[PDB]
Amino acid sequence: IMEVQVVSKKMVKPSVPTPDHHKTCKLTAFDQIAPPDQVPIIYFYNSSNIHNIREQLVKSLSETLTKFYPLAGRFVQDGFYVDCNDEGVLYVEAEVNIPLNEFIGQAKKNIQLINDLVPKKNFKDIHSYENPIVGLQMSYFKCGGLAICMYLSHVVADGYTAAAFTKEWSNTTNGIINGDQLVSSSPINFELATLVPARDLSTVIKPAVMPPSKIKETKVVTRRFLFDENAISAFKDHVIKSESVNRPTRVEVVTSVLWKALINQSKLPSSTLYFHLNFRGKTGINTPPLDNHFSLCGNFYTQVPTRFRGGNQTKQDLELHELVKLLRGKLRNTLKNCSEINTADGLFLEAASNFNIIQEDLEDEQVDVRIFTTLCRMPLYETEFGWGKPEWVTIPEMHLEIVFLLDTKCGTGIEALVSMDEADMLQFELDPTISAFASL
């Protein structure tokens, strides 16, 4: 019964042209090793009941793009920079013939149904001066409910930058609607290339791949698992029982459970699970762009790869607390390393070390590399555009194998959005330790 109809599609440019001194935004070496993907997130909001809501959202987006000007530009391959030509972000307006309260419940069980809310007019990412850096689709449901979907290029921005863009846009809309007294507008800079410029990394970066890993006829599907508060507490007690780690976190236990299931499904004896660690709040340098860590935008993170090595132990002897302790050791070692670095170039060198480790693991017939992105303890459910908090926030169906960790609307549960090959997923969802949490 549900039909989505695109009503408009255009380019939304920043309210004011980008100044001449900012038209070239040079990218960093972090951006060079950033995954060249466009990554989606979608927020669902209940009915505004504001009559000019579409116009005011377009206007607040233009004003936000004034500050996030590189997002309105186009990537140039030769110099590895962003020509901030104000070509604009892709803006899709659609209308769906059903209320929002007859979709979210269905979508939580079958994420595929969100595909008609995600725009894909995008072209080639690294290359293609014609590919827009940001794509937005606003799908208005039958009685005013809103699906805001953002498709952002990881070469220009990381999770922190996407969140800052979202926060600024929502704050601008909220001020435009309810009075400007509710302002929290702090500047963003985009100038980290001063300290780590893009460079030739033929001497710095591991390249790799191998055939048994390169079985490509994969059909990636996505499933949603909800790890509720009571289940997380049970897992925490099951781990503390061992007391080989103290105070396990929600993310630690949920990632350990998912990782054990992935290892049991893997058919390979060793595994490498890597997430992202944001360099911003965890270092002490203050050379110009790092005077204000929370104002700097662009990729500023390191990969954190935890290597489970199955030697002469069986997969049957795998226990939660060992995965927790491996994750904890790797994170602690990375934090200790970050404490002792003097320049931002050294933190790029640490990120490159971890990148090389991940490539070496990708290149082994014995290691299954699994990507994890945790968005938990990020205030996604407090991003307010001026009429209410999000009803739901998730990541739509991915085309690559990945696991996203999100907070639930309230409480301390975790939504795990797992994307993997269908042949693997059909057994994975029936793992007895996680099958009770699958929305299915």
CA angle 374, 36, 63 (to 5 degrees): 75
Given the structure tokens 């795998």, which residue do they identify?
318
* Nearest Cα residue to 69 out of 32, 20, 30: 20
The first and second tokens of residue 255, run together, are: 């990632």
| Torsion-angle region of 98 (φ positive above 0: left; ψ -120 to 50: alpha; else: beta) | beta
Selection from 212, 311, 210, 316 nearest residue 264 by Cα: 316
Are 202 and 119 within one domain? yes
75 and 117, same domain (yes or no): yes
77 in the same domain as 42: yes
Q: Is the separation of the CB atoms in 283 and 347 below 8 Å? A: yes
Does 408 lie in the same domain as 337?
A: yes
CB-neighbour burial class of residue 363 (10 A; exposed 0-12, middle 13-18, buried 19+): middle
Based on the fold, state whether residues 268 and 358 are members of the same structural domain.
yes
- 190 and 248 in a common domain: no
Please tell me whether residues 87 and 117 are part of one structural domain: yes
Provide the token pair at 398.
Answer: 């991915």
Residues 192, 229 within the same domain: no
Instruction: Tell which of 176, 191, 216 closes a domain.
Output: 216
Within 8 A by CB and 6+ apart from 305, the residues are 272, 273, 274, 330, 354, 357, 358, 361
- Residues 59 and 81 reside in one and the same domain: yes
167 and 223 fall within a common domain: no
Question: What would the DSSP string read from start to end of 98-144?
Answer: S-GGGTHHHHHH-GGGGGGGS------SSS-SSS-SEEEEEEE-TTS
Structural domain count, the chain: 2
Q: Which residues contact 373 (CB under 8 A, 6 or more apart)?
A: 159, 275, 276, 402, 403, 404, 405
> Residue 337: which H helix or E strand, with range?
helix 320-339
CB atoms within 10 A of CB 190: 25
Helix or strand or coil: residue 253? helix
Whether residues 328 and 227 share a domain: the answer is yes
Distance CA 349, CA 122 (A): 32
Give the domain range for residue 11. 1-216
Resolution to 1 decimal, in Å?
A: 2.4
Based on the fold, state whether residues 187 and 113 are members of the same structural domain.
yes
CA dihedral of residues 80, 81, 86, 89 (deg, nearest 10):
60
Neighbours of 45 (CB within 10 A): 24
State which approach was used to obtain the coordinates.
X-ray
Q: How many residues does the chain have?
A: 440
DSSP 173-219: HHHHHH-TTS---------GGGTSB----TTT------TTT------
- The closest alpha carbon to 276, from 378, 200, 408, belongs to 378
Boundary residue ending a domain (182, 201, 216): 216
41's tokens: 């997130």
CA–CA dist 281, 277 (Å, integer) = 10
Last residue of a domain, one of 188, 216, 244: 216
Amino acid identity, residue 139? S
